Design a protein around this ligand. Structure first.
Ligand code: MG
Ligand code: MG
Ligand code: MG
Length: 803
RNA sequence: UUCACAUUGCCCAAGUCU
RNA sequence: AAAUGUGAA
């Protein structure tokens, strides 16, 4: 449960394709560098402040310590130098003055880059973490000064263009930068990015922006509260400057002319007229209470400016979002070009600090050979038992019938949309079309709905469903029409999934008024699965050898609360295959600690899923394939430490000695590796993306470990994110080819569409489950209550309610 | 709430002071 | 999931 397995071999399957990766080769010297630990009192100050302190420090003490040695600083307690310092390691305390600080400089170690060169070969067997860290600190020293660091990215005011979002917000552009070891050479991962920022404008113009004013006046009216309430919500927590900066903690109720503070008591507009000799042009407008809520101070809006690129955590409005989308949307070629020209303009080789450490960065994207894996054949049923052949990640169901289609005899229709908008004629025609498409697909809706009744409000949901369950024997499904976005949906799912155990299929009103064969088809894809039907299976003879023995496939995912929240739970979801196809899955879901990635209650979930697998197949899995979504590198060791063991436990407590082999695969969809077609005649579609099946396990992958990029999806828009798969454990000793082919084929078993999805079907179902859980908890966000809300009905346990 | 793909929001990362 | 856009038998 400790070390990830070494890469067994390289993939051989599929035709080759010339690709370019946004990785940039790094020439690293084979010389020692020097680590130094720093201590700065006080330490409660921000990272950038510490950077400033160290900069001033290096400047001042050039003649007795530093001097022509150009150190790098990680913003905390680490400083690296190329050539050594006058250190014994006799610790020297320095006193620094910043427009008042005590600094401790003590030597720690000599980071060997030669050992890193060894490790990159197979000559060392482990990759030195601290060394990679050092190189990273070096690469991001200068841009941490010149730009605004956000995570591993840097953003800045666009050179004379602007991109306003409204509300005092504008688009800032920038780039993610990272240092990664690879099979070949150190790599600088660079990718273009963009995000929202508050314009460094006067607070007055911010008010104009926020309250939709053309300009103040209209008016000199000391606002409403709708103005005061909204403006206060917008500016609170944001920094404002006058030389002196402050954090806005409140907005006064009284105008500057009247707002009073104890000096005897005095008013703001008067105090600024006496001590500061200024006369307010806009006195009627309120004041900003800055600093501590505790105590007082009050600054007029007219003498305050926003600061200096403050990332705007708050959520973007619908219109702002639309603007951002419109601004940052680009095709794969356009993305590629933007990244390239970014790397040209950046000119890393002239950076004095990377120059100090003898580091070279190639200004060209790395050339890498990919392999385009062959898609599996999708076997259908009915009389024909037709075979669909995925072409560029896509196929369809025309003239195909479900492998096992559910015969719908008893069903109901509940419309919560106003009858004026959704008429019985609309329902009738929609029903006719649906019955036709469903008949074609092999899912015969053989009757008219035994029930059809309009209703309104969430309060009407439970009684209506309770009637339906009690009135119609053998009721298979209730189709619910909804008037757009409504709190009724979450309710329907609450009653259906957790309260009554009834199959419900919702459809927006607009998709009833105007039906199309495609929409209806996909809808049937959902309905059939929801009623226990097998849409289609992988061609049994086209599957990898692993299927010769009974094997279970587990999807696993954790979904965390949105940015800003601090009390909502994280949600764990684990699904498990219930046949040899593999097609049917069952779900398990838990609530757990806020922002905990490690699946706390995993063993129980795996036990449930194994039990259900046995009851479904009468087989005990000899192999457990575990697709774990969302775990970053920095968390691998832990997660595998807890989760892998949790699986073993789950087996151990089930039967001794039941020890099926475990393959633990971390799925990463969200990273900064982008692959582009080298040949223009290879780009697919309008977005010009790499074709589905594109597999990369060389050159840019891990120097010693079992990992691979596999873009399994047809890129419709923008630049495809190739899913990265990292194998943390593998008792079954998969070869690269078998595991990659298996993953790719699994990407074709996703029931909700006749396409090849970007991640394996089980992990996707895991996502859907976690999200449905989040739906059951809406407005319900101690432990026992949330857990209760998240627990499905006994008749829903063994279904695919999440489809 | 037909569906996938993209951008954002989600562990690690970052951010936090006078 | 949600906002926003591209798409589809
Ligand atoms: Mg997740
Ligand atoms: Mg953290
Ligand atoms: Mg959408």
């Amino acid at each position: 449960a400790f070390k990830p397995p070494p890469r067994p071999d390289f993939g051989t399957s599929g035709r080759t394709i010339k690709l370019q990766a946004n990785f940039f080769e790094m020439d690293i010297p084979k010389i020692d560098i020097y680590h130094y630990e720093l201590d700065i009192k006080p330490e409660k100050c921000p990272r950038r402040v510490n950077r400033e302190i160290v900069e001033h420090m290096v400047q001042h003490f050039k003649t007795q310590i530093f001097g022509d040695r150009k150190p790098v600083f990680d913003g905390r307690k680490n400083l690296y130098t190329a050539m050594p310092l006058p250190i014994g390691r006799d610790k020297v305390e320095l006193e620094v003055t910043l427009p008042i600080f005590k600094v401790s400089i003590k030597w720690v170690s000599c980071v060997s880059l030669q050992a890193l060169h060894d490790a990159l070969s197979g000559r060392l067997p482990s990759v030195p973490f601290e060394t990679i860290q050092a190189l990273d600190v070096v690469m991001r020293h200068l841009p941490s000064m010149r730009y605004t660091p956000v995570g591993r990215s840097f953003f800045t005011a666009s050179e004379g263009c602007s991109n306003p979002l409204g509300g005092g917000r504008e688009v800032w552009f920038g780039f993610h930068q990272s240092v990664r070891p690879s099979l070949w050479k150190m790599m600088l991962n660079i990718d273009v990015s963009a995000t929202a920022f508050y314009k460094a404008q006067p607070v007055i113009e911010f008010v104009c922006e926020v309250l939709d004013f053309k300009s103040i006046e209209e008016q000199q009216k000391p606002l409403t509260d709708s103005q005061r309430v909204k403006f206060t919500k917008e500016i609170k927590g944001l920094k404002v400057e006058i030389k002196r900066k402050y954090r806005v903690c409140n907005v006064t109720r009284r105008p500057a002319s009247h707002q009073t503070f104890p000096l005897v008591e005095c008013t703001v507009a008067q105090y600024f007229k006496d001590r500061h000799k200024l006369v307010l042009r806009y006195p009627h407008l309120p004041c900003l209470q800055v600093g501590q809520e505790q105590k007082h101070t009050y600054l007029p809006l007219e003498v305050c400016n926003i600061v200096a690129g403050q990332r705007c955590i708050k959520k973007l409005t619908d219109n702002q979002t639309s603007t951002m989308i419109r601004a940052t949307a680009r095709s794969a070629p356009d993305r590629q070009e933007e990244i390239s020209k970014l790397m040209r303009s950046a000119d890393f080789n002239t950076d004095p600090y990377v120059r100090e450490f003898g580091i070279m960065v190639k200004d060209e994207m790395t050339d890498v050979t990919g392999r385009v894996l062959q898609p599996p054949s999708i076997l259908y049923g009915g009389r024909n038992k037709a075979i669909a052949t995925p072409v560029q990640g896509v196929w369809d169901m025309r003239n195909k019938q479900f492998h096992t289609g559910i015969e719908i005899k008893v069903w109901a229709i509940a419309c919560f949309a106003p009858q004026r908008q959704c008429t019985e004629v609309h329902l009738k025609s929609f029903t006719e079309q649906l019955r036709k498409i469903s008949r074609d697909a092999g899912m015969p809706i053989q009757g008219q709905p035994c029930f059809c009744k309009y209703a309104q409000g969430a309060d009407s949901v439970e009684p209506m469903f309770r009637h339906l369950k009690n009135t119609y024997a053998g009721l298979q499904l209730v189709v619910v029409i909804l008037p757009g976005k409504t709190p009724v949906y979450a309710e329907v799912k609450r009653v259906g999934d957790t309260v009554l155990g009834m199959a419900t299929q919702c459809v927006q009103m607009k998709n009833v008024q105007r039906t199309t064969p495609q929409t209806l088809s996909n809808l049937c894809l959902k309905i059939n699965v929801k009623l226990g039907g097998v849409n289609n299976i992988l061609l049994p003879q086209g599957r990898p050898p692993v299927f010769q023995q009974p094997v279970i496939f587990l999807g696993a995912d954790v979904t965390h609360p949105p940015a800003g929240d601090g009390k909502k739970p994280s949600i764990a979801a684990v699904v498990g295959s219930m046949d040899a196809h593999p097609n049917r899955y069952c779900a398990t879901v838990r609530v757990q600690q806020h922002r905990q990635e490690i699946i706390q209650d995993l063993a129980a979930m795996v036990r449930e899923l194994l039990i259900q697998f046995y009851k479904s197949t009468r087989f005990k899995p000899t192999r457990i394939i575990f697709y774990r979504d969302g775990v970053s590198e920095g968390q691998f060791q832990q997660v595998l430490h807890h989760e892998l063991l949790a699986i073993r436990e789950a087996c151990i407590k089930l039967e001794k000695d039941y020890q099926p082999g475990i393959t633990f695969i971390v799925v990463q969809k969200r990273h900064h590796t982008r692959l582009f077609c080298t040949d223009k005649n290879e780009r697919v579609g309008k977005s010009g993306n790499i074709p589905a099946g594109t597999t990369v396990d060389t050159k840019i992958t891990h120097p010693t470990e079992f990992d691979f990029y596999l873009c399994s999806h047809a890129g419709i828009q923008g630049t495809s994110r190739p899913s990265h798969y990292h194998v943390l454990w593998d008792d079954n000793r998969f070869s690269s080819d078998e595991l990659q082919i298996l993953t790719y084929q699994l990407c074709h078993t996703y029931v909700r569409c006749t396409r090849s999805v970007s991640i394996p079907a089980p992990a996707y179902y895991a996502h859907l489950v976690a999200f449905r859980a989040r739906y059951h908890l809406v407005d319900k966000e101690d432990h026992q209550a949330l857990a209760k809300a998240v627990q499905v009905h006994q008749d829903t346990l063994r279904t695919m309610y999440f489809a």
